[PDB]
């Protein structure tokens, strides 16, 4: 009977009755908590392992060690010593893998084709048994880590993240620098006689103890088979009894309370951070007092904190609630962005926060509020979307450290205890005497006197004046603040309509008129009471010029701003929407429980069509938008490279610069005039998909149409005005370079695009097979071996019905160097395709085949596939079977000549464009790089386009 290897098997693991997956919890003899998940339907299997150690446990003298260790586990073990055996195995079997390191966890996960779980899992287990920490792998990979940090140096959030740590108790582990870099991980340790390979060995051996591990494995196999699999590969992980680190002392003590920080940002942002130290509430998960308070302080409904701050013209957005620290400490935060007026009223903003908090004290804890949260969580759990395996295993592996086996599925959802004592206890901590205030603004530029070490952040620290504390300690009740009222959007009809006699497997065109094209599919898979309603509204006036594009955007920002109070309830109640301006007009998506969904939709369109602009709101949002256009200069070099390629290659695209300029001519009169004109003529293309009938779809569609007709007199657009934009057609054998400088970041970025031809069955699968075959090798060569940077990407580029192969890299090395390395790589690849076995070739076909045929696990993933088919106007709903049937037909030969025809350096149809984004500072061993021709340097985007042909558009299916 009893198994020596297993300490215990848990009881039934509580799950949604919608969840057909099966589950078994156990604890191994060496202390590993395990969840097993059997899903005989799944296409990919998955596992994850979470070690409850992370950077808070780094040696004080080697910042980043556990992060570095996390990179190093992938680079070879005693049992699979090839540096990239792991990632190549995954690649060849339709899988992928990643890992992350937080202060208390290191979390590793992969997925793979369901037939190769055991193979993937065996390779993975070795990470936790005997990594090699190869000496030469170590000297190389330390560059990946350094580059990971380089990218973050000039990110505002990362700097604030480390600044908070820099300003608490400096003796506290909380002040550690988790990322690491070349300095902390190589230079300084060399200076100090440290053998980093030994330190890695020591840290792994000391902390990667079985008692601190949780594993989750998801597979087609029975629960018994999964059980033996996990026993077999993980029993041997060794138990060293490591005590779980704990941090009962808060890193913010008294000398750190009532402090004000004035911080200089990189982007032009204006924000206020208010933070209070609290005890660790994790153990109170059955009541969740911190979520209760977040719900209330963070509310955006009538009566709310935000709603007053926004009326006063001081803030546009607010988040509040509990934020994690580590075992022993937490924080409660309330953060807002600041208008210009807001920037001068910080003191009053915070008084308001304290008045709102005093109101919660006065009314006392509210059982009815707790019930809503509880009901809404109960419903969210019952109808949760099936997760993608890799995310699911990863997530559960982390939380197995916090909840009994039997509750891991529900612990984060199901509320059980009403706890007015905890709610008051936490409320007693949200007091001016334990407050920390941080203001982020360019106005502090030059007025600061400190420098944070790791990021360079400039700031000032000041005692908040006792008198300001007092004024806050006496916050009176303010009549503008009320608790929210019953949330009427809470769904209660969950009936799944029976599948109609005329139901179809793909969307059907059930209406084709001048005004509107309606694609419809009743859900025949998921059976949750939800739906997705997507609409493209076409109008030439959304993008005719920069000015109109600015107006389209501001219109919609104003509209969302104006619906926000009303829409917030719907969103809490699992009904949300997304509304934005596109280069073709407008995009609207309403998703969630399909119960109350027509009410929200009808409200949106009605407000759209009878919209009245508040002037103060207009000015505020206009000023915010200007700044966001400027803030583009502080994006990363590789985002820049991607952006310019988009501008270069699309028929019509307005630059950020053009938009900025045109922005000053946006006046109130001008905007009021634009809206009716935009709405006067439209065509609507819709996908309605979910728990809805044909009749309800025609109904919803016509309702949108009628509302627009009634209030805005909309008429149909002419078929010819349904412009789609084309892609610049590159000449046989040309190479064009476009060069630019990133002014903020000290890295460069490049994007290289080898344009092939129009999309079609054969052309797509040539390009996809090739990308599949070169995919891990590019990563492995350009990053793991040559360490050109952290960001190294390769793959298909698809736009405007055209396609090709692209490379994106962000590096310290200059673009012209990057080019030559990619070119050298490309030659390695042709040779490699010649040299590979037939069977290696067929594995790649099979891996691409599995990737393409992976079934959607939830409604909105299936919707997205259809929506891609519609917005691209290819309407190829059965493309995966078609393209995969064709893929299976292909030979080495085909790919060799495809490459030779379209991709090789001397290819007769090479069509190459490169975007070079220079690092802030630049002024303008290895396989063999081919000689390259003189590029044509693009001097002006408009000229470049004028001088080239444009491709056709792709024909509909």
């Amino acid at each position: 009977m009893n198994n020596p290897a297993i300490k215990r098997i848990g009881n039934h693991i509580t799950k949604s009755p919608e969840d057909k997956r099966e589950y078994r919890g156990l604890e191994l003899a060496n202390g590993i908590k395990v969840l097993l998940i059997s899903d005989p339907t799944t296409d990919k299997s998955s596992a994850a392992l979470d070690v409850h150690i992370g950077s808070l446990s780094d040696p004080p003298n080697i910042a980043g060690l556990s992060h570095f260790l996390q990179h190093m586990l992938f680079l070879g073990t005693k049992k699979y010593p090839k540096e990239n055996e792991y990632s190549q195995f995954l690649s060849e079997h339709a899988g992928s893998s990643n890992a992350f390191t937080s202060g208390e966890h290191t979390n590793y996960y992969f997925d793979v084709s369901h037939e190769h779980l055991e193979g993937a899992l065996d390779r993975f287990a070795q990470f936790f048994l005997s990594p090699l920490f190869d000496e030469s792998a170590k000297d190389r990979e330390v560059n990946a880590v350094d580059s990971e940090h380089e990218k973050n140096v000039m990110n505002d959030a990362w700097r604030l993240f480390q600044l908070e740590k820099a300003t608490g108790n400096p003796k506290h582990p909380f002040s550690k620098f988790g990322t690491g870099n070349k300095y902390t991980l190589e230079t300084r340790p060399n200076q100090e006689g440290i053998d980093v390979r030994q330190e890695l060995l020591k840290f792994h051996s000391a902390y990667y103890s079985s008692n601190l591990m949780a594993v989750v494995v998801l597979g087609r196999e029975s629960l018994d088979d999964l059980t033996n699999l996990v026993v077999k590969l993980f029993s041997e992980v060794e138990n060293k009894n490591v005590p779980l680190p704990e941090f009962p002392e808060h890193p913010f003590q008294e000398e750190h309370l009532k402090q004000l920080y004035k911080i200089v940002p990189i982007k032009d942002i204006r924000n206020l951070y208010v933070t209070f130290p609290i005890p660790d509430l994790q153990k109170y998960y059955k009541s969740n007092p911190g979520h209760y308070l977040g719900h209330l302080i963070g509310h955006e409904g009538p009566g709310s904190l935000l709603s007053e701050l926004k009326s006063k013209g001081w803030v546009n957005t607010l988040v509040g609630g509990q934020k994690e620290g580590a075992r022993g400490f937490m924080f409660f935060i309330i953060n807002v962005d600041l208008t210009e007026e807001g920037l001068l009223h910080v003191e009053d903003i915070i008084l308001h926060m304290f008045q709102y908090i005093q109101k919660l004290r006065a009314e006392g804890p509210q059982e009815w509020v707790f019930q809503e949260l509880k009901d809404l969580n109960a419903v969210a759990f019952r109808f949760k979307d099936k997760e993608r395996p890799r995310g699911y295993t990863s997530k559960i592996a982390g939380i197995l450290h916090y909840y009994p086996l039997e509750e891991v599925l529900t612990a984060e959802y199901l509320l059980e205890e009403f706890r007015p004592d905890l709610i008051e206890m936490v409320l007693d901590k949200l007091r001016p005497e334990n407050v920390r205030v941080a203001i982020v603004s360019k106005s502090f530029e030059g007025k600061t006197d400190r420098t944070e070490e790791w990021y360079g952040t400039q700031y000032k620290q000041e005692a908040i004046p006792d008198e300001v504390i007092k004024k806050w300690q006496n916050a009176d009740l303010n009549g503008k603040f009320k608790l929210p009222t019953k949330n009427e959007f809470i769904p209660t009809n969950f009936e799944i309509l029976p599948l109609e006699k005329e139901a179809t497997p793909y969307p059907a065109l059930i209406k084709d008129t001048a005004m509107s094209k309606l694609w419809f599919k009743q859900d025949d898979k998921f059976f949750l009471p939800k739906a997705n309603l997507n609409f493209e509204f076409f109008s030439p006036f959304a993008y005719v010029d920069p000015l109109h594009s600015n107006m389209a955007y501001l219109y919609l920002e104003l509209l969302k701003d104006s619906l926000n109070e009303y829409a917030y309830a719907a969103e809490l109640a699992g009904l949300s929407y997304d509304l934005q301006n596109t280069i073709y007009g407008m995009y609207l998506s309403v998703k969630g429980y399909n119960d109350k969904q027509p009410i929200l939709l009808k409200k949106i369109i009605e407000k759209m069509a009878t919209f009245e602009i508040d002037e103060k709101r207009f000015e505020i949002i206009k000023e915010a938008y200007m700044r966001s256009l400027n803030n583009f200069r502080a994006e990363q070099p590789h985002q820049h490279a991607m952006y310019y390629l988009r501008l270069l290659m699309t028929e019509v695209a307005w630059t950020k610069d053009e938009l900025k300029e045109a922005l000053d001519d946006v006046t109130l009169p001008r905007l009021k005039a634009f809206i009716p004109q935009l709405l006067s003529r439209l065509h609507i293309e819709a996908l309605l998909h979910g728990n809805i009938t044909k009749q309800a779809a025609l109904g919803i569609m016509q309702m949108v149409e009628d509302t627009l007709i009634e209030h805005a007199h909309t008429k149909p657009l002419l078929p010819s005005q349904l412009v789609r934009y084309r892609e610049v057609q590159l000449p046989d054998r040309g190479w064009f370079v476009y060069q630019q400088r990133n002014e903020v970041h000290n890295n460069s970025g490049i994007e290289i695009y080898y344009q092939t031809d129009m999309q079609s069955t054969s052309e797509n699968m040539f390009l996809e097979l090739f990308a599949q075959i070169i995919s891990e090798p590019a990563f492995n060569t350009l990053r793991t071996k040559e360490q050109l940077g952290y960001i190294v990407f390769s793959g298909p580029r698809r736009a405007n019905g055209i396609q090709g192969l692209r490379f994106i890299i962000q590096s310290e090395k200059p673009p012209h160097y990057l080019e030559s390395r990619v070119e050298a790589f490309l030659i390695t690849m042709e040779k490699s395709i010649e040299d590979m076995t037939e069977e290696a070739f067929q594995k790649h076909i099979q891996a691409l085949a599995i990737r393409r045929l992976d079934k959607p696990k939830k409604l909105s993933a299936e919707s997205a596939k259809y929506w891609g088919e519609i917005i691209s106007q290819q309407y190829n709903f059965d493309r995966d079977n078609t393209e995969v049937a064709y893929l299976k037909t292909l030979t080495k030969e085909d790919i060799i000549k495809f490459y030779k025809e379209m991709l090789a350096v001397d290819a007769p149809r090479r069509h190459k464009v490169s975007v070079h984004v220079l690092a802030r500072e630049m002024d303008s061993n290895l396989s063999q790089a081919p000689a390259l021709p003189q590029p044509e340097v693009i001097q002006n985007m408009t000229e470049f386009k004028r001088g080239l042909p444009l491709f056709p558009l792709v024909k509909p299916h």
């Binding site: 990643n98 937080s102 202060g103 977040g294 963070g298 988040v319 509040g320 509990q322 994690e324």
Partner: peptide, 20 residues
């Protein structure tokens, strides 16, 4: 707004990609 999943807790790259 209530602190997001990714705010209250530290997210994987995987969790971040879930929003795209």
């Amino acid at each position: 707004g209530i602190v997001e999943q990714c705010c209250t807790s530290i997210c994987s790259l995987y969790q971040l990609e879930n929003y795209c």
